[PDB]
């Protein structure tokens, strides 16, 4: 079968542009229509444009006319989508998807010609985050456990990862040793444009004051690595 391989994730400031590649790692490429569909988080699918490489023709949705450009490379079997004048509303997952049937033979080719039977082969998607915030390392604060070592049952402790950008961050406990009861929550996007999340472990109360608990926060975009010891 056919596989569509897309480029990695992208982060852009507003007003800039982004170009996503779509490598058709299979047979079809030449006589097949390729479409570019984006999907905002928690929203519906939106088609931006399509291209037929053999005919050198493109068709763009009226919403993206003027700032979208879809090109093809017949040699390497690769498709491209370039979106300029990026706005924060363009933050979405961008997919490239081939059509299901070979294009029909068109003797009189319209420059905007395109066909659509159905997109059966899709790529893995490319996340494009359009913000205006700058890269910032997070401040890591402990979340001290409420209960004591004699209160019985289980206790909860964690770490607060505040005011960082961009995603993602990774939080381990005891250098990857403590993996049970760990619940790292999805980050929140504040009005300032920075993210904030928390990760917590549900530990036996009798282990408080006996087992050392350390959270390992790693934010690669800012080269920030913080080891914070959480104590009662």
């Amino acid at each position: 079968e056919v596989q569509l391989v897309q480029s990695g994730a992208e982060v852009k400031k507003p007003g800039s542009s982004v170009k996503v590649s779509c490598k058709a790692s299979g047979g079809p490429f030449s006589s097949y229509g390729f479409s570019w569909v984006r999907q905002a988080p928690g929203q519906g699918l939106e088609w931006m444009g399509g291209i037929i490489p053999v005919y050198g023709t493109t068709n763009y949705a009226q919403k993206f006319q003027g700032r979208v450009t879809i090109t093809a490379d017949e040699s390497t079997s690769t498709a491209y989508m370039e979106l300029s004048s990026l706005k924060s509303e363009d933050t979405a997952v961008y997919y490239c998807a081939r059509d299901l049937q070979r294009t029909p033979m068109v003797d009189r080719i319209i420059g905007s010609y395109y066909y659509y039977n159905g997109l059966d082969v899709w790529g893995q998607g490319t996340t494009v985050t359009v913000s205006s915030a700058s890269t910032k390392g997070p401040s890591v604060f402990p979340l001290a456990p409420s209960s004591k070592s004699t209160s019985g049952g289980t206790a909860a402790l964690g770490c607060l990862v505040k005011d960082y950008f961009p995603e993602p961050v990774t939080v381990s406990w005891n250098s990857g040793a403590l993996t049970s009861g760990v619940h790292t929550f999805p980050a929140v996007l504040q009005s300032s444009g920075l993210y904030s999340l928390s990760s917590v472990v549900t530990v036996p109360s009798s282990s408080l004051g006996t087992q050392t608990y350390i959270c390992n926060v790693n934010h690669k975009p800012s080269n920030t690595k913080v080891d914070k010891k959480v104590e009662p």
């Binding site: 039977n117 159905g118 998607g125 604060f141 909860a156 505040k162 929140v188 904030s196 917590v200």
Partner: protein, 211 residues
Amino acid sequence: SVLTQPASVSGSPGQSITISCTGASSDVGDYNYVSWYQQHPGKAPKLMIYDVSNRPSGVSNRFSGSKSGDTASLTISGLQAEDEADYYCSSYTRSSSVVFGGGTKLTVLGQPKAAPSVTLFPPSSEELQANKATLVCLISDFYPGAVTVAWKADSSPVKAGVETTTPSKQSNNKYAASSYLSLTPEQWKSHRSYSCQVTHEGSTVEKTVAP
């Protein structure tokens, strides 16, 4: 041209269900390039129906499509738990060259309820030394993923500085969410206590911290 789709449909296992695209059928002598897609979270859409009554190889015969007038319909027979996903319809017109519908979230009912396990943390001493304060309220293991959070300080509701995430499915088919309350160190120790109330399906669980 816009294709309208029900925002949500719900059925039980064994039940049959019909979603309905109610957009493009236009342009009388032109043909109907109508198609349907299924999309699970974090994965690419999957072509289930095209060409409106046709179905590609490998797709279960429980899915079928039809169209009457300006309304197309996707019928799913013998609902299974794996069918719970998002569904979209599409259509090619001369005017607009494809239009993906708004989408329909299909829910497979019958699953048991689950009250949320809530943990609330006071601000650290290390954070207060930096002249900042943040309350961490963590919501875990509730079913389904619909919940709302209200913060209070000594029975008085507070709106300023509340940042709440959207629910997300865990690895155990239950959902999780977190809420953050930002405060100055004066507002934290001047008040008597702070509470995070998590109301889920009318049942409210509460936790309280104090300096």
